[PDB]
Amino acid sequence: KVFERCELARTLKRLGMDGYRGISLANWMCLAKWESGYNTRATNYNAGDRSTDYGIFQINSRYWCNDGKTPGAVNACHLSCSALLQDNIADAVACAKRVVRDPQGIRAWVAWRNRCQNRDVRQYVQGCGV
Asked: What is the annotated localization of this protein?
């Protein structure tokens, strides 16, 4: 499923992401936008280390979810990576919350540093009623 901007913003709000571990909703929106373009089916194989990024938040198979084919898999979210390709993002959200409970927080995603950090991210939630 490819979410519309405000549809995703309200969905994230309902799932308790606004202010989670100090991260505003606009920051989560900027992350999803640049990671997948709000597409839950997004997958990206990393030929260099044999891992794959899954779903709307592009969560990696080495540390977070298990796909069975990634060397040194940790599966910190205790989730099949398949759960991150659903139209329903409840599982992706639960895992994203796990990711940010580590010291790095949202900095864990390089894309966030490149395109959201220290920038005006208000535009992502404006007009959504959140």
From this structure: Secreted
Catalytic, out of 18, 49, 53, 87: 53
Q: Which two tokens stand for residue 124?
A: 């992502």
| CA distance linking residue 5 with residue 128, whole number of Å | 8
Of the candidates 4, 7, 35, 49, the residue annotated as catalytic is 35
Length of the chain: 130
Domains defined for the chain, CATH in brackets: 1-130 (1.10.530.10)
Catalytic-residue membership of 67: no
- Residue 35 annotated among the catalytic residues of the structure: yes
CA–CA distance, 80 with 95 (Å, rounded to integer): 11
What residue has token string 């992502």? Answer: 124
Contact criterion met (CB below 8 Å) for 7 and 56? no
CB atoms within 10 A of CB 113: 12
